């Protein structure tokens, strides 16, 4: 991607977002046991 | 009788011993 913006005077950042699907499934098998399974599909983040 | 040639299946590429990072092929042992 090439951005052409402007001749600003101060240093600036290009804050860019990539829309993804970040979800979580929450298992609670037994009392005091909670497990979460995260998932981001475009920017992979593992099934931790 | 014709010879009995059992098929040769490839090992599970997603099995127990498998250390997988998303981007690349899974390391195995």
- CA distance linking residue A7 with residue B6, whole number of Å: 72
Place of tokens 């931790």: A48
Cβ pair A46:B22 closer than 8 A: yes
B22 touches chain A (CB under 8 A): yes
Please indicate if any CB of chain B lies within 8 Å of the CB of A44. Answer: yes
**Burial of B20 by CB count in 10 Å (0-12 exposed, 13-18 middle, 19+ buried)?**
middle
Q: How far is A23 from chain B (nearest CA, A)?
A: 17
Q: How was this structure determined?
A: cryo-EM
Closest CA to A22 of A6, A5, A45: A45
Give the Cα-Cα-Cα angle A11, A16, A19 (nearest 5 degrees): 170
């Amino acid at each position: 991607m090439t951005f052409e913006v402007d001749p600003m005077d101060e240093p600036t950042l290009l804050y860019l977002l990539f829309e993804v699907f970040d979800v979580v499934r929450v298992h609670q098998p037994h009392r005091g046991v909670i497990e979460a399974v995260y998932l981001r599909t475009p920017f992979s983040a593992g099934n931790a | 009788e014709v010879p009995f040639v059992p098929p040769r299946y490839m090992a599970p590429t997603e099995g127990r011993n498998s250390i997988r990072y998303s981007e690349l092929a899974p390391q195995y042992d």
